[PDB]
Amino acid sequence: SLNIKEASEKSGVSADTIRYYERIGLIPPIHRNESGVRKFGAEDLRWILFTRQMRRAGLSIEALIDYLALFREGEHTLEARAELLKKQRIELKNRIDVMQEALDRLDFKIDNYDTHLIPAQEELKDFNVE
């Protein structure tokens, strides 16, 4: 198993972020060895990586906290977990759709520079009139 410094280097998540994840219930409680120190197993690293990934994708701490809490309650929460993730999925896909509309807008503007504005050496206003 890994100590926290090793877990940080492996996950690309800072040691203090890992401490925070555990304290507020984003990742399961971590084993403490005889000397009082955290020792991280494979499933701990998987929770760390999942948290890092979902947070960077915009899922809130509060949803992720709820999901781990249901997970720790065991099999009687399977249906509530599938539902929670399905709600997060729709929200995420909506965020993706928003971002893609902006990328499409940027692509249109860039095509306009490449195809029209730069060859004419004209601003869009200029060019539109002609």
* Sequential DSSP letters for 12-42: TS-HHHHHHHHHHTSSPPPEE-TTS-EEB-H
* Closest by CA position to 29, among listed 14, 15, 13, 44: 44
Binding to its own copies by residue 99, rule CB under 8 A?
A: yes
Give, as ranges, the residues between 23 and 62 that touch ligand MED (CB under 6 A): 46-47, 50
Q: Output 103 or 129, the one with its CB closest to ligand MED.
A: 103
| Contacts (CB under 8 A) with its own copies, residues 3-42 | none
Q: Which residues pair with 39 in a beta bridge?
A: 31
Give me the least distance between CB of 55 and its own copies, in Å please.
10
Q: Which residues sit at the interface with ligand MED, rule CB under 6 A?
A: 46-47, 50, 71, 109, 112
